[PDB]
RNA sequence: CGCACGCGCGCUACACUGACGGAGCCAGCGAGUCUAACCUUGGCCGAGAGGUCUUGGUAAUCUUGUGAAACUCCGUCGUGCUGGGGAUAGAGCAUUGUAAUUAUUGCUCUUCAACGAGGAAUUCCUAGUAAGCGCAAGUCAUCAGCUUGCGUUGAUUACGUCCCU
């Protein structure tokens, strides 16, 4: 179980309607503090478009 | 009977009798005012 | 609204009012009871309020539905609004505000 | 607020008077001056205005000097002191006070009986007090009507406490050393007593009076036996009682199915075991 | 026994020095100024060990405050101390360290929450 | 961030320092789950190890803690904070006890053993607070 | 000012519009030593507190532009009686008051409580009223919580009569 998220994102970002941390909860693994960490390195893949930045409210948009 | 009672013959509309149930406990340390005697060494058994 | 609404600007919306063409208005209120005096039995009558209730079953339940139904929510305040105006056109009945949508045309119909 | 300490200065001069004038203020509201002697057969001037000026400060009577329709009225203590005097007269209260308990039209006043075991003088004063045309008419009769409607399941096999006397505002309820469902911590038989909340309104439909009103103060695990803790039920659920003919039972019957589902689950995170029951059986099996 | 460190160092200290290591609500008391009210107390102490059956029990000499601090030096003497009226006999030892002589007080016939018998004396018997 | 998973490695609950310093809370506040260690003890380790509070924390290595054993294991040379602790330079002993789950409550109540055997406040009434308030 | 019970008052916490490390740095009803111990504007003394080792003031100048607060932006944590709260209490610090005791509040850091907008009943509301947030004062030797204000920023719902009274 090493890179099953690597294939089930690059074949499932055009299957999942959004990109968030609640995608990961469908497999029931982690709910916790490894989430606000992961907003600044995720979109180096390059399929979903970022929109806005705010330090208290870091929000982007699904595509 | 003069000393084997709780209430005088006032029954015949008045008192509920005030019961003084004596359950004394010792006063060990030294020096006592009116107050502090009963709260010295209360072994509440 | 401005920090949230680009998600709603994806789902079949060029400008974000285009699905919302047929969404806000189509909850048009037609019928609601009054509290009958009754004399004892507090029954209900088949009468009509002005059409601002199934409006407020869809708009005042978005006032709570944006802030106060996102107050103490699992997710945040403004970003549980990724769903609030997608399919709000007609009766879905499986939601926080659409569950009592049939109950303006049947509550004033059941005991009338 | 309350006064209590204006009573013990009297003599027999008011004891013949009271329930003659209490049945005399009902036959003839506000009584003028020279009638306190002559309703009771008390004499005209043998210790008389001495005794009425004694009663005057005590607020159980007041000098309502109107224009030839004078007033001697048996203020608010004309019910209150004189029902204490009535329980001194009807052989229940022998002195006043070991009392702790607060409501609005039900104060819990902890007393000891003629027997010696305790009971409770609950007092009825609604509107606080506001005692007027119907407020006195209520607390006279809501002490009498609720002397009649606390036995609706005691005869029928279930737990309703028993009333004793109905003196003018006073309703005497043994005394119940309760433990409500906000005071309790744990239980030994949980899943029996959730399905018995469907089943208590089953019992309430046998007598023809459905009761609802259940908050966290309601069901007293009380103290019948102190040592071995043979507890019981006190069910403070009464005043949401509705005659079933009225058109509100569409949402009273559905309360019996899907409204009690929180307290044995959440208060007692422990998700429950048992079954339930409707009241469609109780429509026919009264 | 005063700290655990050497006892021939600590017992005869005044209102000066260690409290400049201690915090300022009990440093704005003990490291400001010695308050020498226990200095003529020694002069009555030096006679309160002479004519006793020695090492055992001297006389209960009275003392009537609530913010006065005793220093441990004086193993073997007795002083009666304020408790609201009377004078609690204390065989003065190093077994009290910087706490009030007038802390010897809980001054009431006790608070009736378990046996409420004096509340029964205020209620109403009634004619 | 990094779309990479692992092979059975990460837990969710640990058992660390004789009690549960967990594998979902860090060094800092799972040493608050056990009683006796506050924030800035392991947050002054941040200027020497750069480990702050921002993670789900079944990640700790027992050799980074060995440079924190350079801060822990002898309580007499190893940067113990001096305006911080639970009980600290005490009337009880005199040292700054930044102790642990098994060593706070045994080093806490020598101010409550004392004063009214000594006739003042805390030597009968706190024993009354153990002969009555403890049962 | 000690606590078997009960009420009300305001203030909060029960969370991700939350507060935190710092930059974006505004008001006024403004108030300050006479025949003196006030308001305070130099770096640091100091873990911190200010002394006013100094200075400026009979006053919109010197505090003062009360460089006020809620605060806006780079970094902090995605629901876990929780990085929510400091509830209770201890240890390392003062400005004092002739001494902080029943600590008088100003000061660094841990202890982190009930409580999942909470049963009954409701408090005030229209062109400037809800709603927060400050300032400084009789409280000040220790601050405002009450208070009278001013200032900052300022929401759903509306011209109506007895249903409550």
mmCIF file of N, CA and C in Angstrom, chain D residues 13 46-56:
data_model
loop_
_atom_site.group_PDB
_atom_site.id
_atom_site.type_symbol
_atom_site.label_atom_id
_atom_site.label_comp_id
_atom_site.label_asym_id
_atom_site.label_seq_id
_atom_site.Cartn_x
_atom_site.Cartn_y
_atom_site.Cartn_z
ATOM 1 N N UNK D 13 -61.071 34.374 70.001
ATOM 2 C CA UNK D 13 -61.898 35.421 69.399
ATOM 3 C C UNK D 13 -61.974 35.401 67.874
ATOM 4 N N UNK D 46 -67.375 42.530 74.230
ATOM 5 C CA UNK D 46 -66.592 41.787 75.220
ATOM 6 C C UNK D 46 -65.318 41.333 74.507
ATOM 7 N N UNK D 47 -64.287 42.177 74.549
ATOM 8 C CA UNK D 47 -63.025 41.920 73.898
ATOM 9 C C UNK D 47 -63.097 41.894 72.387
ATOM 10 N N UNK D 48 -63.695 42.915 71.764
ATOM 11 C CA UNK D 48 -64.097 42.767 70.370
ATOM 12 C C UNK D 48 -63.275 43.638 69.430
ATOM 13 N N UNK D 49 -63.313 44.959 69.608
ATOM 14 C CA UNK D 49 -62.508 45.781 68.712
ATOM 15 C C UNK D 49 -61.053 45.766 69.152
ATOM 16 N N UNK D 50 -60.802 45.390 70.409
ATOM 17 C CA UNK D 50 -59.481 44.929 70.819
ATOM 18 C C UNK D 50 -58.987 43.801 69.915
ATOM 19 N N UNK D 51 -59.828 42.792 69.673
ATOM 20 C CA UNK D 51 -59.400 41.645 68.875
ATOM 21 C C UNK D 51 -59.371 41.967 67.383
ATOM 22 N N UNK D 52 -60.179 42.928 66.936
ATOM 23 C CA UNK D 52 -60.193 43.261 65.513
ATOM 24 C C UNK D 52 -59.056 44.224 65.181
ATOM 25 N N UNK D 53 -58.680 45.080 66.134
ATOM 26 C CA UNK D 53 -57.459 45.857 65.987
ATOM 27 C C UNK D 53 -56.226 44.979 66.152
ATOM 28 N N UNK D 54 -56.348 43.869 66.895
ATOM 29 C CA UNK D 54 -55.313 42.841 66.871
ATOM 30 C C UNK D 54 -55.197 42.205 65.494
ATOM 31 N N UNK D 55 -56.326 41.847 64.880
ATOM 32 C CA UNK D 55 -56.301 41.285 63.535
ATOM 33 C C UNK D 55 -55.898 42.291 62.463
ATOM 34 N N UNK D 56 -55.985 43.594 62.753
ATOM 35 C CA UNK D 56 -55.873 44.620 61.718
ATOM 36 C C UNK D 56 -54.467 44.695 61.127
#
